[PDB]
C-alpha cells in the first residue's frame, strides 16, 4: 500500500558471523527470527570488499570503480556522492515517501577534503542527495571526528570547545595514542591507530576540541537505533525509507555495559550480539505500530569480515571455531569470495512468504532499479547505470539469477561472479594485506577461475583448463568498462 522500505546494513558483517549462517560461537535471536520470517539469501554479493565504494554502488546504482576517488577517500573526504548525482533517496522522494539516512556513512561530507567547517554548516550534505532527516557518525568510528552530523550541522555542538581536524598534522598540547599509551583506558590499538585520543580510545587522524559533541562508543548503538526508532516513530502514517547503516561491527568495538565482556570470541562476538539487539528494537517498534506487515526489510552488509582492524581486541586469539567468511576464503579488502559474499534477509510479510533459504546470485548495485519498479518510479534515463531490475528475485517469487555479478576488490581488481565460475583478472598486488589484517587478497598476476560448486572455498585454479570460460569472463568485464 506504497510499503516502508528500511536497509539495516551492517559494516563489515560477514557471511559466517550470524547464527542463522552457521555459527556454534554468537547467539543472535533477532535477525534469527527476522529471517525465519522472511528469506534468508545465500548468495548475495555487495558490489566491493571495502566500506566506501561498496556504499556508493547501492545508493547510486553505479559501480564505485568507474569514479576515480571513490577507492581512496580521504579521511576528511568531501562528498564522494555529488548532488547531481541521483540516488536512491532520490528515488524514494520521486514516489512521495519521506527519506531518512542514520548511522554509519563512509561517504564524505562537505564539497572538497579537508574543507569542513565543524563550527559551522557543513554543505554539502545528505539533503543534497534527497534524505530528508540524517543523523550520522561524521567519521566511522576507527577516525576522526568523533561526533555525530544532525541534517548538516553537528549534534550537540559545543562552543567552549571548538572543533579542528587534521589528517596531516598533529595538534600542539594534544596527547596521542602513540606517546600516551596510559591515556587509553578503554581500548589500546594494534596496527596502526594511534593518533587522536577520544573516549579512552586512540583513532586515525587527529582532532582538537568537541566538548559535549563527542560520542562515547558504548552508547553509538543506543543512539543512532534511538534516532532510527524516532524517524519511523514521527513518519508512522506515510510511506518512508530509512536507510539506518550501524557501527557495528566495525572497529574499534567498544559495546553497550549490556553486551560487553559476555561472548567468548570478546569485544568482536559483543559487537555481534549489539547488532542483533539494535536489529531486535526496529523490529519492536515495527510491532508496537502496527507496521511490521506492509515494512519491507532489506538487512545486509556492505562488505566481508576482518578480525584484527586495528585494535588489541583479541580477535584472532578468541575466534576459535567462528569462522566469520563462513566457507568463503577472503575477508575484508580480498577479491576472494570472503570480501563481497555477504548475508541478506529480506523480510515484508504482505508480499514475502516465510521460512525461505534461497541461493539465488544476486547484487546490492540492483537495489535502487528493484525498489523503484516496487514503488512505480521509472529512473531517468542514464541515471542508476549499472542497476537491474530483479525485485521479484530480491522477494522470493523468481529464483532466476542476475547473468552475472561484478566485485571490486580494494586494488580495483575487479572479478565476476557467474552461475558456478568466480573469475579474477590478473594484478600486480601482494597475496596478502600488508598493514595489518592477515587476510588472503586473491591477488595473482595470472588469470584465476575457481568451480564454486566443488568447492565455495576457492583453492584449485581452473583457468589452464577453460580457455573458453576464461574469454566468456574476460569478454564481460571489457563489456562492462566499455559502458564508461
Ligand atoms: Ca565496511
Ligand atoms: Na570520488
Ligand atoms: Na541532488
Given at each position: 500500500?506504497?510499503?516502508?522500505?528500511?536497509i539495516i546494513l551492517a559494516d563489515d558483517l560477514?557471511?559466517?558471523?550470524?547464527?542463522?549462517?552457521?555459527?556454534?560461537?554468537?547467539?543472535?535471536?533477532?535477525?534469527?527470527?527476522?529471517?525465519?520470517?522472511?528469506?534468508?539469501?545465500?548468495?548475495?554479493?555487495a558490489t566491493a570488499s571495502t566500506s566506501t565504494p561498496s556504499r556508493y554502488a547501492l545508493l547510486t546504482g553505479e559501480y564505485a570503480?568507474?569514479k576515480?576517488?571513490t577507492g581512496?577517500a580521504?579521511?576528511?573526504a568531501?562528498m564522494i556522492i555529488?548532488?547531481?548525482q541521483?540516488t536512491i533517496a532520490?528515488?524514494?522522494?520521486?514516489?512521495?515517501?519521506?527519506?531518512?539516512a542514520?548511522g554509519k556513512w563512509h561517504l564524505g561530507?562537505?564539497?572538497?577534503?579537508?574543507?569542513?567547517?565543524?563550527?559551522?554548516?557543513?554543505?554539502?550534505?545528505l539533503?543534497?542527495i534527497?534524505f530528508?532527516?540524517?543523523?550520522i557518525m561524521?567519521?566511522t568510528?576507527?577516525?576522526?571526528?568523533?561526533?555525530?552530523?544532525?541534517?548538516?550541522?553537528?549534534?550537540?555542538?559545543?562552543?567552549?570547545?571548538?572543533?579542528?581536524?587534521?589528517?596531516?598534522?598533529?595538534?600542539?598540547?594534544?596527547?596521542?595514542?602513540?606517546?600516551?599509551?596510559?591515556?587509553?583506558?578503554?581500548?589500546?590499538?594494534?596496527?596502526?591507530?594511534?593518533?587522536?585520543?577520544?573516549?579512552?580510545?586512540?583513532?586515525?587522524?587527529?582532532?582538537?576540541?568537541?566538548?559535549?559533541?563527542?560520542?562515547?562508543?558504548?552508547?553509538?548503538?543506543?543512539?543512532?537505533?534511538?534516532?532510527?526508532?524516532?524517524?519511523?516513530?514521527?513518519?508512522?502514517?506515510?510511506?518512508?525509507?530509512?536507510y539506518f547503516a550501524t557501527n557495528?561491527?566495525h572497529?574499534?568495538?567498544?559495546?553497550?555495559?549490556?553486551?560487553?565482556?559476555?561472548?567468548?570470541?570478546?569485544?568482536?562476538?559483543?559487537?555481534?550480539?549489539?547488532?542483533?539487539?539494535?536489529?531486535?528494537?526496529?523490529?519492536?517498534?515495527?510491532?508496537?505500530?502496527?507496521?511490521?506487515?506492509?515494512?519491507?526489510?532489506?538487512?545486509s552488509s556492505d562488505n566481508?569480515?576482518?578480525?584484527?582492524?586495528?585494535?588489541?581486541?583479541?580477535?584472532?586469539?578468541?575466534?576459535?571455531?567462528?569462522?566469520?567468511?563462513?566457507?568463503?576464503?577472503?575477508?575484508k579488502?580480498?577479491?576472494?569470495?570472503?570480501?563481497t559474499?555477504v548475508?541478506?534477509?529480506?523480510?515484508?510479510?504482505?508480499?514475502?512468504?516465510?521460512?525461505?533459504?534461497?541461493?539465488?546470485?544476486?547484487?546490492q548495485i540492483?537495489w535502487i532499479?528493484?525498489?523503484?519498479?516496487?514503488?512505480?518510479?521509472?529512473?531517468?534515463?542514464?541515471?542508476?547505470?549499472?542497476?537491474?531490475?530483479?525485485?521479484?528475485?530480491?522477494?522470493?517469487?523468481?529464483?532466476?539469477?542476475?547473468?552475472?555479478?561484478?566485485?571490486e576488490?580494494?586494488?580495483?581488481?575487479?572479478?565476476?561472479?557467474?552461475?558456478?565460475?568466480?573469475?579474477?583478472?590478473?594484478?600486480?598486488?601482494?597475496?596478502?594485506?600488508?598493514?595489518?589484517?592477515?587476510?588472503?587478497?586473491?591477488?595473482?598476476?595470472?588469470?584465476?577461475?575457481?568451480?564454486?560448486?566443488?568447492?565455495?572455498?576457492?583453492?584449485?585454479?581452473?583457468?589452464?583448463?577453460?580457455?573458453?570460460?576464461?574469454?566468456?569472463?574476460?569478454?564481460?568485464?571489457?563489456?562492462?568498462?566499455?559502458?564508461?
Open positions: 500500500t506504497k510499503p516502508n522500505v528500511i560477514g557471511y559466517g558471523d550470524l547464527e542463522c549462517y552457521g555459527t556454534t560461537r554468537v547467539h543472535t535471536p533477532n535477525v534469527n527470527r527476522l529471517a525465519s520470517e522472511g528469506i534468508r539469501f545465500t548468495n548475495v554479493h570503480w568507474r576515480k576517488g581512496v580521504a579521511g576528511n568531501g555529488r548532488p547531481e541521483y532520490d528515488m524514494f522522494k520521486s514516489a512521495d515517501y519521506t527519506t531518512g542514520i561530507l562537505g564539497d572538497k577534503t579537508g574543507t569542513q567547517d565543524w563550527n559551522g554548516t557543513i554543505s554539502p550534505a539533503k543534497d534527497g530528508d532527516y540524517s543523523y561524521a567519521a568510528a576507527d577516525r576522526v571526528p568523533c561526533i555525530y552530523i544532525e541534517n548538516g550541522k553537528v549534534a550537540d555542538y559545543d562552543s567552549t570547545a571548538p572543533i579542528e581536524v587534521s589528517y596531516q598534522k598533529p595538534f600542539e598540547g594534544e596527547p596521542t595514542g602513540r606517546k600516551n599509551p596510559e591515556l587509553l583506558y578503554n581500548l589500546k590499538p594494534s596496527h596502526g591507530h594511534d593518533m587522536a585520543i577520544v573516549n579512552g580510545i586512540s583513532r586515525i587522524g587527529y582532532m582538537k576540541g568537541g566538548g559535549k559533541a563527542l560520542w562515547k562508543d558504548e552508547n553509538i548503538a543506543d543512539t543512532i537505533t534511538s534516532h532510527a526508532i524516532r524517524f519511523i516513530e514521527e513518519n508512522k502514517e506515510r510511506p518512508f525509507f530509512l557495528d561491527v572497529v574499534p568495538r567498544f559495546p553497550h555495559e549490556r553486551f560487553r565482556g559476555k561472548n567468548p570470541m570478546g569485544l568482536r562476538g559483543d559487537a555481534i550480539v549489539q547488532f542483533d539487539w539494535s536489529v531486535g528494537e526496529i523490529m519492536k517498534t515495527l510491532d508496537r505500530l502496527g507496521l511490521t506487515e506492509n515494512t519491507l526489510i532489506i538487512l566481508g569480515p576482518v578480525l584484527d582492524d586495528g585494535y588489541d581486541d583479541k580477535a584472532v586469539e578468541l575466534a576459535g571455531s567462528h569462522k566469520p567468511g563462513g566457507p568463503f576464503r577472503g575477508g579488502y580480498s577479491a576472494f569470495e570472503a570480501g559474499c548475508p541478506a534477509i529480506v523480510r515484508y510479510p504482505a508480499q514475502v512468504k516465510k521460512n525461505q533459504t534461497l541461493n539465488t546470485l544476486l547484487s540492483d532499479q528493484s525498489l523503484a519498479s516496487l514503488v512505480n518510479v521509472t529512473i531517468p534515463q542514464s541515471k542508476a547505470p549499472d542497476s537491474q531490475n530483479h525485485l521479484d528475485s530480491w522477494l522470493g517469487k523468481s529464483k532466476k539469477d542476475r547473468p552475472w555479478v561484478i566485485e576488490s580494494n586494488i580495483l581488481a575487479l572479478s565476476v561472479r557467474k552461475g558456478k565460475w568466480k573469475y579474477i583478472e590478473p594484478s600486480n598486488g601482494s597475496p596478502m594485506i600488508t598493514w595489518g589484517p592477515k587476510i588472503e587478497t586473491g591477488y595473482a598476476p595470472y588469470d584465476q577461475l575457481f568451480d564454486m560448486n566443488k568447492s565455495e572455498f576457492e583453492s584449485e585454479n581452473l583457468a589452464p583448463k577453460y580457455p573458453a570460460i576464461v574469454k566468456e569472463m574476460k569478454d564481460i568485464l571489457v563489456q562492462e568498462r566499455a559502458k564508461g
